[PDB]
């Protein structure tokens, strides 16, 4: 997360509204995915904050 370098926001709203058929009830869910377009570039490799350790593992 850099400010200068920030990319925007993504939001989603009802355009009209969800309508369930009779005999049906409750919440429905959306699943959401993310992937990169063929457009994409990544550069300057470094270490991930996503993994660390405190002592060497053993068998």
């Amino acid at each position: 997360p850099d400010t200068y370098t920030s990319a925007g926001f993504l939001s989603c709203w009802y355009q009209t509204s969800l309508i369930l058929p009779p005999e049906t009830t409750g919440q429905v869910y959306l699943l959401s995915f993310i992937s990169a377009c063929p457009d994409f570039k990544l550069r300057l490799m470094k270490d991930t904050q996503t993994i660390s350790q405190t002592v060497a593992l053993t068998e």
């Binding site: 490799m45 470094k46 270490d47 991930t48 904050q49 350790q53």
Partner: peptide, 23 residues
């Protein structure tokens, strides 16, 4: 070590960070 921004920065003088597997 080169610790670019976004990558764990060393806390002790012998942290896992110093493994520097990608840096």
């Amino acid at each position: 070590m080169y610790v670019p921004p976004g990558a764990p920065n060393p806390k002790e003088w012998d942290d896992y960070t110093w493994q520097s597997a990608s840096n």
